[PDB]
Amino acid sequence: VDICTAKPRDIPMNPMCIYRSPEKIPEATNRRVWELSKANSRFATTFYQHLADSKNDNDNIFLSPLSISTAFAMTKLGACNDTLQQLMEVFKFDTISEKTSDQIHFFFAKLNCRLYRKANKASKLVSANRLFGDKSLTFNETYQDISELVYGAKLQPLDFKENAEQSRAAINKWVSNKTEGRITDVIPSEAINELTVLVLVNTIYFKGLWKSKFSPENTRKELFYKADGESCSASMMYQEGKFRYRRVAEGTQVLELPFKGDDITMVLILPKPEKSLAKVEKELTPEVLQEWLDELEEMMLVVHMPRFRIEDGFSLKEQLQDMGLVDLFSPEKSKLPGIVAEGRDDLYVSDAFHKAFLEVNEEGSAAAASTAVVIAGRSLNPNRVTFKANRPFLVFIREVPLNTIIFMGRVANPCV
Ligand SMILES: *[C@@H]1O[C@H](CO)[C@@H](O[C@@H]2O[C@H](CO)[C@@H](O)[C@H](O)[C@H]2NC(C)=O)[C@H](O)[C@H]1NC(C)=O
Ligand SMILES: *[C@@H]1O[C@H](CO)[C@@H](O)[C@H](O)[C@H]1NC(C)=O
Ligand SMILES: *[C@@H]1O[C@H](CO)[C@@H](O)[C@H](O)[C@H]1NC(C)=O
Protein backbone atom coordinates (compact mmCIF):
# COMPACT_ATOMS: atom_id res chain seq x y z
CA VAL A 1 0.00 0.00 0.00
CA ASP A 2 1.42 3.35 -1.06
CA ILE A 3 0.38 6.99 -1.01
CA CYS A 4 -0.98 6.77 -4.57
CA THR A 5 -3.30 3.79 -4.08
CA ALA A 6 -4.33 4.63 -0.52
CA LYS A 7 -8.04 4.47 0.25
CA PRO A 8 -9.75 6.09 3.28
CA ARG A 9 -9.82 2.75 5.13
CA ASP A 10 -6.02 2.68 4.69
CA ILE A 11 -5.76 5.98 6.61
CA PRO A 12 -7.52 5.01 9.87
CA MET A 13 -8.01 7.93 12.23
CA ASN A 14 -8.61 6.92 15.85
CA PRO A 15 -11.89 8.58 16.96
CA MET A 16 -12.40 10.35 20.27
CA CYS A 17 -10.61 12.91 18.12
CA ILE A 18 -12.50 13.91 15.01
CA TYR A 19 -13.59 17.35 13.89
CA ARG A 20 -16.91 17.73 12.12
CA SER A 21 -16.60 20.75 9.84
CA PRO A 22 -19.70 22.97 9.38
CA GLU A 23 -21.82 22.92 6.21
CA LYS A 24 -21.64 25.74 3.67
CA ILE A 25 -15.13 22.00 -12.05
CA PRO A 26 -12.20 21.52 -14.48
CA GLU A 27 -12.02 18.13 -16.23
CA ALA A 28 -9.32 15.58 -15.35
CA THR A 29 -9.00 17.26 -11.93
CA ASN A 30 -9.78 15.38 -8.72
CA ARG A 31 -12.59 17.12 -6.83
CA ARG A 32 -10.92 15.91 -3.64
CA VAL A 33 -7.53 17.60 -4.21
CA TRP A 34 -9.35 20.49 -5.87
CA GLU A 35 -11.29 21.28 -2.70
CA LEU A 36 -8.15 20.87 -0.60
CA SER A 37 -6.22 23.21 -2.90
CA LYS A 38 -8.81 25.98 -2.47
CA ALA A 39 -8.58 25.54 1.30
CA ASN A 40 -4.76 25.63 1.17
CA SER A 41 -4.89 28.72 -1.03
CA ARG A 42 -7.23 30.36 1.45
CA PHE A 43 -4.65 29.84 4.16
CA ALA A 44 -2.00 31.02 1.70
CA THR A 45 -3.43 34.45 0.94
CA THR A 46 -4.54 34.88 4.56
CA PHE A 47 -1.12 34.09 6.01
CA TYR A 48 0.45 36.30 3.32
CA GLN A 49 -1.68 39.33 4.08
CA HIS A 50 -0.98 38.89 7.75
CA LEU A 51 2.74 38.65 7.14
CA ALA A 52 3.07 41.54 4.70
CA ASP A 53 0.89 43.57 6.99
CA SER A 54 3.49 43.35 9.75
CA LYS A 55 6.47 43.90 7.45
CA ASN A 56 8.13 46.90 5.83
CA ASP A 57 7.19 47.36 2.13
CA ASN A 58 10.81 47.50 0.99
CA ASP A 59 11.57 43.99 2.24
CA ASN A 60 11.27 40.89 0.09
CA ILE A 61 9.16 37.90 1.10
CA PHE A 62 9.15 34.25 0.14
CA LEU A 63 7.55 31.25 1.80
CA SER A 64 5.98 27.96 0.81
CA PRO A 65 2.40 28.06 2.12
CA LEU A 66 1.87 24.55 0.71
CA SER A 67 4.76 23.41 2.90
CA ILE A 68 3.38 25.08 6.00
CA SER A 69 -0.11 23.73 5.41
CA THR A 70 1.28 20.24 4.85
CA ALA A 71 3.61 20.14 7.83
CA PHE A 72 0.76 21.21 10.09
CA ALA A 73 -1.66 18.80 8.50
CA MET A 74 0.80 15.98 9.30
CA THR A 75 1.22 17.24 12.87
CA LYS A 76 -2.56 17.35 13.44
CA LEU A 77 -2.72 13.58 12.96
CA GLY A 78 -1.98 13.30 16.67
CA ALA A 79 -4.02 16.30 17.78
CA CYS A 80 -7.35 16.39 19.61
CA ASN A 81 -10.03 18.65 21.16
CA ASP A 82 -9.51 22.37 20.74
CA THR A 83 -5.98 21.80 19.52
CA LEU A 84 -7.40 19.65 16.73
CA GLN A 85 -10.17 22.14 16.03
CA GLN A 86 -7.83 25.13 16.02
CA LEU A 87 -5.70 23.45 13.37
CA MET A 88 -8.77 22.79 11.26
CA GLU A 89 -9.84 26.43 11.41
CA VAL A 90 -6.55 28.30 11.18
CA PHE A 91 -5.50 26.26 8.18
CA LYS A 92 -8.95 26.58 6.58
CA PHE A 93 -9.46 22.83 6.35
CA ASP A 94 -12.96 23.36 7.79
CA THR A 95 -13.95 25.47 4.81
CA ILE A 96 -14.44 22.25 2.90
CA SER A 97 -18.17 21.49 2.84
CA GLU A 98 -18.53 19.14 5.76
CA LYS A 99 -15.42 17.05 5.96
CA THR A 100 -14.07 15.40 9.08
CA SER A 101 -10.51 16.11 10.06
CA ASP A 102 -9.72 12.48 9.31
CA GLN A 103 -10.76 12.95 5.65
CA ILE A 104 -8.38 15.83 5.17
CA HIS A 105 -5.47 13.41 5.47
CA PHE A 106 -7.04 11.36 2.68
CA PHE A 107 -7.21 14.47 0.48
CA PHE A 108 -3.55 15.11 1.22
CA ALA A 109 -2.64 11.55 0.26
CA LYS A 110 -4.27 12.30 -3.08
CA LEU A 111 -2.62 15.72 -3.28
CA ASN A 112 0.86 14.60 -2.23
CA CYS A 113 0.77 11.59 -4.56
CA ARG A 114 0.60 13.89 -7.62
CA LEU A 115 3.09 16.47 -6.30
CA TYR A 116 5.97 14.11 -5.58
CA ARG A 117 5.06 10.83 -7.29
CA LYS A 118 3.89 12.05 -10.77
CA ALA A 119 6.84 13.74 -12.42
CA ASN A 120 9.91 14.13 -14.50
CA LYS A 121 13.54 14.58 -13.50
CA ALA A 122 12.53 18.10 -14.57
CA SER A 123 10.23 19.85 -12.10
CA LYS A 124 10.43 17.53 -9.18
CA LEU A 125 9.44 18.92 -5.80
CA VAL A 126 11.36 17.89 -2.71
CA SER A 127 9.23 17.56 0.41
CA ALA A 128 10.73 18.13 3.86
CA ASN A 129 8.22 17.60 6.67
CA ARG A 130 9.58 16.38 9.95
CA LEU A 131 8.53 16.49 13.58
CA PHE A 132 11.51 16.26 15.90
CA GLY A 133 10.82 14.94 19.37
CA ASP A 134 13.11 14.33 22.34
CA LYS A 135 14.08 10.67 22.78
CA SER A 136 11.78 10.38 25.78
CA LEU A 137 8.78 10.77 23.44
CA THR A 138 7.11 7.80 21.77
CA PHE A 139 4.86 8.45 18.81
CA ASN A 140 1.70 6.40 18.51
CA GLU A 141 2.06 3.59 15.94
CA THR A 142 -0.93 4.89 14.01
CA TYR A 143 0.62 8.34 14.06
CA GLN A 144 4.01 7.26 12.66
CA ASP A 145 2.34 4.94 10.19
CA ILE A 146 0.07 7.53 8.64
CA SER A 147 2.68 10.32 8.73
CA GLU A 148 4.88 7.97 6.72
CA LEU A 149 2.31 6.78 4.21
CA VAL A 150 0.62 10.15 3.63
CA TYR A 151 3.33 12.71 4.24
CA GLY A 152 6.47 10.60 3.76
CA ALA A 153 7.40 12.15 7.07
CA LYS A 154 9.29 10.60 9.93
CA LEU A 155 8.66 11.40 13.60
CA GLN A 156 12.40 11.53 14.41
CA PRO A 157 13.62 11.19 18.03
CA LEU A 158 16.64 13.31 18.92
CA ASP A 159 18.40 13.64 22.25
CA PHE A 160 17.40 17.24 23.04
CA LYS A 161 17.96 16.89 26.79
CA GLU A 162 21.74 16.42 26.84
CA ASN A 163 22.55 16.73 23.13
CA ALA A 164 20.53 19.81 22.13
CA GLU A 165 23.22 21.44 19.99
CA GLN A 166 24.25 18.30 18.09
CA SER A 167 20.57 17.71 17.29
CA ARG A 168 20.00 21.22 16.00
CA ALA A 169 23.06 20.55 13.84
CA ALA A 170 21.55 17.24 12.74
CA ILE A 171 18.29 19.00 11.88
CA ASN A 172 20.11 21.61 9.86
CA LYS A 173 22.06 18.93 8.01
CA TRP A 174 18.95 16.93 7.14
CA VAL A 175 17.23 20.00 5.64
CA SER A 176 20.37 21.13 3.82
CA ASN A 177 20.59 17.64 2.32
CA LYS A 178 16.99 18.01 1.12
CA THR A 179 17.51 21.50 -0.33
CA GLU A 180 20.67 20.45 -2.17
CA GLY A 181 22.57 22.72 0.19
CA ARG A 182 20.61 25.90 -0.55
CA ILE A 183 18.98 26.03 2.91
CA THR A 184 21.50 25.31 5.67
CA ASP A 185 20.04 26.86 8.83
CA VAL A 186 16.30 26.27 9.12
CA ILE A 187 16.96 26.27 12.89
CA PRO A 188 18.56 29.56 14.08
CA SER A 189 21.41 29.78 16.61
CA GLU A 190 20.25 28.90 20.14
CA ALA A 191 16.64 27.85 19.51
CA ILE A 192 17.00 24.30 20.79
CA ASN A 193 17.99 23.73 24.43
CA GLU A 194 17.60 20.95 27.02
CA LEU A 195 14.02 22.21 27.47
CA THR A 196 13.02 21.54 23.86
CA VAL A 197 10.32 18.92 23.41
CA LEU A 198 8.86 19.11 19.91
CA VAL A 199 10.10 20.95 16.86
CA LEU A 200 8.22 21.03 13.57
CA VAL A 201 10.34 21.52 10.49
CA ASN A 202 9.30 21.90 6.88
CA THR A 203 10.39 23.26 3.49
CA ILE A 204 9.91 22.54 -0.18
CA TYR A 205 12.75 22.71 -2.67
CA PHE A 206 12.27 23.49 -6.34
CA LYS A 207 14.74 24.06 -9.14
CA GLY A 208 13.41 24.48 -12.64
CA LEU A 209 14.46 25.91 -15.95
CA TRP A 210 12.41 28.50 -17.77
CA LYS A 211 10.57 26.98 -20.74
CA SER A 212 11.59 30.24 -22.43
CA LYS A 213 14.95 31.49 -21.15
CA PHE A 214 16.37 34.98 -21.28
CA SER A 215 19.78 35.57 -22.77
CA PRO A 216 22.50 36.94 -20.46
CA GLU A 217 23.66 39.11 -23.36
CA ASN A 218 20.42 41.08 -23.19
CA THR A 219 20.58 41.51 -19.41
CA ARG A 220 21.70 44.96 -18.26
CA LYS A 221 21.85 47.32 -15.27
CA GLU A 222 18.54 49.17 -15.00
CA LEU A 223 16.89 51.25 -12.27
CA PHE A 224 14.36 49.66 -9.93
CA TYR A 225 11.87 51.93 -8.14
CA LYS A 226 11.37 50.83 -4.53
CA ALA A 227 8.35 51.69 -2.36
CA ASP A 228 10.46 54.25 -0.47
CA GLY A 229 10.90 56.56 -3.48
CA GLU A 230 14.59 55.70 -3.78
CA SER A 231 15.83 53.67 -6.76
CA CYS A 232 18.65 51.20 -7.27
CA SER A 233 20.60 49.32 -9.91
CA ALA A 234 19.19 45.92 -10.84
CA SER A 235 20.19 43.21 -13.31
CA MET A 236 17.22 43.51 -15.63
CA MET A 237 16.64 40.51 -17.91
CA TYR A 238 14.91 40.88 -21.27
CA GLN A 239 13.14 38.85 -23.93
CA GLU A 240 10.18 38.78 -26.25
CA GLY A 241 7.98 35.74 -26.55
CA LYS A 242 4.55 34.22 -26.14
CA PHE A 243 3.26 34.28 -22.54
CA ARG A 244 -0.14 33.94 -20.93
CA TYR A 245 -1.06 37.45 -19.84
CA ARG A 246 -3.83 39.87 -18.93
CA ARG A 247 -4.08 43.43 -17.68
CA VAL A 248 -6.70 43.39 -14.94
CA ALA A 249 -8.47 45.80 -12.56
CA GLU A 250 -6.87 49.22 -12.09
CA GLY A 251 -4.11 48.42 -14.53
CA THR A 252 -2.47 45.50 -12.74
CA GLN A 253 -0.48 43.30 -15.16
CA VAL A 254 -0.47 39.54 -14.65
CA LEU A 255 2.21 37.46 -16.43
CA GLU A 256 2.82 33.71 -16.33
CA LEU A 257 6.33 32.35 -17.03
CA PRO A 258 6.24 28.55 -17.31
CA PHE A 259 9.04 26.18 -16.33
CA LYS A 260 10.17 23.23 -18.43
CA GLY A 261 7.56 20.52 -17.92
CA ASP A 262 4.53 22.85 -18.08
CA ASP A 263 3.15 21.64 -14.73
CA ILE A 264 4.85 24.38 -12.72
CA THR A 265 4.84 28.10 -13.51
CA MET A 266 5.89 31.45 -12.09
CA VAL A 267 3.13 34.05 -11.96
CA LEU A 268 4.04 37.71 -11.55
CA ILE A 269 1.60 40.37 -10.35
CA LEU A 270 2.62 43.94 -11.18
CA PRO A 271 0.41 46.94 -10.34
CA LYS A 272 0.49 50.14 -12.39
CA PRO A 273 3.00 52.81 -11.34
CA GLU A 274 0.18 54.87 -9.84
CA LYS A 275 -0.86 52.02 -7.52
CA SER A 276 0.94 50.50 -4.54
CA LEU A 277 1.77 46.81 -4.25
CA ALA A 278 0.49 47.20 -0.68
CA LYS A 279 -2.97 48.03 -1.98
CA VAL A 280 -2.92 45.03 -4.31
CA GLU A 281 -1.88 42.86 -1.34
CA LYS A 282 -4.89 43.87 0.76
CA GLU A 283 -7.18 43.34 -2.22
CA LEU A 284 -5.80 40.00 -3.37
CA THR A 285 -8.32 37.39 -2.26
CA PRO A 286 -8.39 33.69 -3.22
CA GLU A 287 -11.25 34.42 -5.60
CA VAL A 288 -9.79 37.59 -7.09
CA LEU A 289 -6.54 35.74 -7.71
CA GLN A 290 -8.33 32.79 -9.28
CA GLU A 291 -10.43 35.06 -11.50
CA TRP A 292 -7.24 36.73 -12.75
CA LEU A 293 -5.57 33.45 -13.64
CA ASP A 294 -8.72 32.58 -15.65
CA GLU A 295 -8.37 35.74 -17.78
CA LEU A 296 -4.87 34.91 -19.02
CA GLU A 297 -4.25 34.23 -22.73
CA GLU A 298 -1.20 33.45 -24.85
CA MET A 299 0.29 36.62 -26.24
CA MET A 300 3.46 38.07 -27.73
CA LEU A 301 4.99 40.67 -25.52
CA VAL A 302 8.15 42.21 -24.24
CA VAL A 303 9.25 41.14 -20.80
CA HIS A 304 11.67 43.01 -18.55
CA MET A 305 12.18 41.24 -15.23
CA PRO A 306 15.06 41.55 -12.75
CA ARG A 307 17.23 38.70 -11.51
CA PHE A 308 16.80 38.07 -7.78
CA ARG A 309 17.67 35.89 -4.83
CA ILE A 310 15.36 35.67 -1.85
CA GLU A 311 16.09 33.64 1.25
CA ASP A 312 13.46 33.93 3.95
CA GLY A 313 13.52 32.04 7.24
CA PHE A 314 10.47 31.87 9.52
CA SER A 315 9.75 31.06 13.17
CA LEU A 316 6.03 30.35 12.82
CA LYS A 317 4.74 30.19 16.42
CA GLU A 318 4.36 33.94 16.88
CA GLN A 319 2.18 34.61 13.80
CA LEU A 320 0.30 31.32 13.90
CA GLN A 321 -0.68 32.02 17.53
CA ASP A 322 -1.79 35.48 16.66
CA MET A 323 -3.95 33.79 14.03
CA GLY A 324 -5.79 31.42 16.36
CA LEU A 325 -3.43 28.46 16.68
CA VAL A 326 -3.01 28.61 20.46
CA ASP A 327 -3.35 25.26 22.25
CA LEU A 328 -0.76 23.51 20.07
CA PHE A 329 2.00 25.67 21.57
CA SER A 330 0.60 25.59 25.11
CA PRO A 331 1.82 23.14 27.80
CA GLU A 332 -1.46 23.45 29.74
CA LYS A 333 -3.89 23.44 26.80
CA SER A 334 -2.07 21.25 24.25
CA LYS A 335 -3.82 18.00 23.40
CA LEU A 336 -1.47 15.83 21.32
CA PRO A 337 -2.49 12.30 22.45
CA GLY A 338 -0.45 10.86 19.60
CA ILE A 339 2.71 11.73 21.46
CA VAL A 340 3.49 10.11 24.82
CA ALA A 341 6.31 10.46 27.35
CA GLU A 342 6.95 8.41 30.51
CA GLY A 343 5.03 10.21 33.23
CA ARG A 344 5.54 13.45 31.33
CA ASP A 345 3.05 16.10 32.33
CA ASP A 346 2.40 18.15 29.20
CA LEU A 347 3.34 17.50 25.57
CA TYR A 348 3.27 20.46 23.19
CA VAL A 349 4.98 21.94 20.12
CA SER A 350 7.92 24.07 21.26
CA ASP A 351 8.29 25.79 17.91
CA ALA A 352 8.04 25.30 14.15
CA PHE A 353 10.53 26.54 11.60
CA HIS A 354 10.28 27.05 7.84
CA LYS A 355 12.73 28.43 5.31
CA ALA A 356 12.33 29.16 1.61
CA PHE A 357 14.83 29.80 -1.14
CA LEU A 358 14.24 31.58 -4.45
CA GLU A 359 16.96 32.48 -6.95
CA VAL A 360 15.90 33.67 -10.42
CA ASN A 361 18.12 34.17 -13.44
CA GLU A 362 18.24 33.84 -17.21
CA GLU A 363 18.09 30.05 -16.93
CA GLY A 364 15.23 29.99 -14.45
CA SER A 365 15.10 28.82 -10.84
CA ALA A 366 18.47 27.07 -10.71
CA ALA A 367 22.20 27.41 -11.41
CA ALA A 368 23.26 30.26 -13.71
CA ALA A 369 24.99 29.72 -17.09
CA SER A 370 26.13 31.46 -20.28
CA THR A 371 23.39 30.21 -22.58
CA ALA A 372 22.97 32.87 -25.31
CA VAL A 373 19.95 33.01 -27.64
CA VAL A 374 19.65 33.27 -31.43
CA ILE A 375 16.31 34.11 -33.03
CA ALA A 376 16.16 34.05 -36.83
CA GLY A 377 13.49 35.34 -39.17
CA ARG A 378 11.19 36.83 -36.57
CA SER A 379 9.10 39.93 -37.11
CA LEU A 380 6.69 40.75 -34.30
CA ASN A 381 3.71 43.10 -34.24
CA PRO A 382 5.08 46.63 -33.68
CA ASN A 383 2.28 47.25 -31.16
CA ARG A 384 2.80 44.38 -28.75
CA VAL A 385 2.42 44.80 -24.99
CA THR A 386 5.42 45.35 -22.76
CA PHE A 387 5.79 44.13 -19.18
CA LYS A 388 8.50 46.03 -17.33
CA ALA A 389 8.82 44.95 -13.68
CA ASN A 390 11.08 47.69 -12.39
CA ARG A 391 8.87 48.20 -9.32
CA PRO A 392 7.67 45.83 -6.54
CA PHE A 393 5.64 42.87 -7.76
CA LEU A 394 4.14 39.74 -6.25
CA VAL A 395 5.37 36.26 -7.09
CA PHE A 396 3.66 32.90 -7.18
CA ILE A 397 5.07 29.53 -8.15
CA ARG A 398 2.11 27.27 -8.82
CA GLU A 399 1.46 23.72 -9.85
CA VAL A 400 -1.23 24.45 -12.45
CA PRO A 401 -2.84 21.04 -12.91
CA LEU A 402 -3.42 20.96 -9.12
CA ASN A 403 -4.33 24.62 -8.55
CA THR A 404 -1.69 24.69 -5.88
CA ILE A 405 0.34 27.62 -4.74
CA ILE A 406 3.71 26.07 -3.96
CA PHE A 407 5.42 29.33 -3.10
CA MET A 408 4.45 32.94 -2.90
CA GLY A 409 6.42 36.07 -2.49
CA ARG A 410 7.24 39.63 -3.19
CA VAL A 411 10.16 41.32 -4.89
CA ALA A 412 10.23 44.76 -3.31
CA ASN A 413 13.97 45.18 -3.83
CA PRO A 414 16.12 42.92 -6.07
CA CYS A 415 19.20 45.14 -5.92
CA VAL A 416 22.72 44.48 -4.62
C1 LIG B 1 -2.16 4.61 20.22
O1 LIG B 1 -3.54 4.93 20.44
C2 LIG B 1 -4.36 3.76 20.66
C3 LIG B 1 -5.77 4.27 20.87
O2 LIG B 1 -6.47 4.34 19.64
C4 LIG B 1 -3.86 2.95 21.88
O3 LIG B 1 -4.52 1.66 21.90
C5 LIG B 1 -5.74 1.59 22.56
O4 LIG B 1 -5.50 1.20 23.92
C6 LIG B 1 -6.72 1.19 24.71
C7 LIG B 1 -6.32 0.85 26.14
O5 LIG B 1 -4.97 0.40 26.19
C8 LIG B 1 -7.74 0.20 24.12
O6 LIG B 1 -8.96 0.28 24.85
C9 LIG B 1 -8.00 0.52 22.64
O7 LIG B 1 -8.85 -0.48 22.09
C10 LIG B 1 -6.67 0.58 21.88
N1 LIG B 1 -6.90 0.96 20.49
C11 LIG B 1 -6.32 0.27 19.51
C12 LIG B 1 -7.22 -0.27 18.41
O8 LIG B 1 -5.10 0.05 19.47
C13 LIG B 1 -2.34 2.72 21.84
O9 LIG B 1 -1.89 2.23 23.10
C14 LIG B 1 -1.59 4.01 21.49
N2 LIG B 1 -0.17 3.73 21.33
C15 LIG B 1 0.72 4.38 22.07
C16 LIG B 1 2.19 4.16 21.76
O10 LIG B 1 0.39 5.14 22.98
C1 LIG C 1 -11.14 15.66 23.74
O1 LIG C 1 -12.52 15.82 23.42
C2 LIG C 1 -13.31 14.71 23.91
C3 LIG C 1 -14.73 14.92 23.38
O2 LIG C 1 -14.71 15.32 22.01
C4 LIG C 1 -13.22 14.63 25.45
O3 LIG C 1 -13.93 13.50 25.93
C5 LIG C 1 -11.74 14.52 25.86
O4 LIG C 1 -11.64 14.53 27.28
C6 LIG C 1 -10.95 15.69 25.27
N1 LIG C 1 -9.55 15.62 25.65
C7 LIG C 1 -8.77 14.62 25.23
C8 LIG C 1 -7.27 14.82 25.36
O5 LIG C 1 -9.22 13.58 24.75
C1 LIG D 1 20.46 12.95 1.51
O1 LIG D 1 21.80 12.50 1.80
C2 LIG D 1 22.09 11.21 1.23
C3 LIG D 1 23.45 10.77 1.76
O2 LIG D 1 23.31 9.75 2.75
C4 LIG D 1 22.04 11.30 -0.30
O3 LIG D 1 22.33 10.02 -0.87
C5 LIG D 1 20.64 11.75 -0.73
O4 LIG D 1 20.61 11.94 -2.14
C6 LIG D 1 20.24 13.06 -0.02
N1 LIG D 1 18.84 13.34 -0.29
C7 LIG D 1 18.49 14.10 -1.33
C8 LIG D 1 17.26 14.98 -1.19
O5 LIG D 1 19.13 14.10 -2.39
Q: Element order, helices and strands?
A: HEHHHEEHEHEEEEEEHHEEHEEEEEE
> Helix/strand/pairing class, anyone?
alpha+beta
CATH topology of the largest domain: Antithrombin, Chain I, domain 2
Number of helices: 9
Backbone shape: globular
Q: How many domain modules?
A: 2
How many strands, what sense, and barrel or not for the largest sheet?
9 strands, mixed
CATH class bucket of the largest domain: Alpha Beta
| Rg, Å, rounded | 22 Å
Q: Tell me roughly what share of residues is in helical segments.
A: 25-40%
PDB class: blood clotting
Keywords: inhibition, serine protease inhibitor, blood clotting
Assembly: monomeric
Entry title: Crystal Structure of P13 Alanine Variant of Antithrombin
Describe this structure in words.
The structure is a monomer. By secondary structure, the chain is α+β, with helices and mostly antiparallel strands. It folds into two domains: 210-305 and 368-415, Alpha-1-antitrypsin, domain 1; 8-209 and 306-362, Antithrombin, Chain I, domain 2 (2-Layer Sandwich). It is built from nine helices and 18 strands. Strands 1, 7, 8, 9, 10, 11, 16, 17 and 18 form a nine-stranded mixed β-sheet that branches. Helix 1 crosses helix 4. The longest helix has 23 residues, at 31-53. The structure holds a molecule of 2 linked components (NAG-NAG) and 2-acetamido-2-deoxy-beta-D-glucopyranose (2 copies). Pfam families: Serpin (PF00079). Glycans are attached at residues 81, 120, 140, 177. Keywords: Blood coagulation, Disease variant, Disulfide bond, Glycoprotein, Hemostasis, Heparin-binding, Phosphoprotein, Protease inhibitor, Secreted, Serine protease inhibitor, Signal, Thrombophilia. It comes from Homo sapiens (Human).
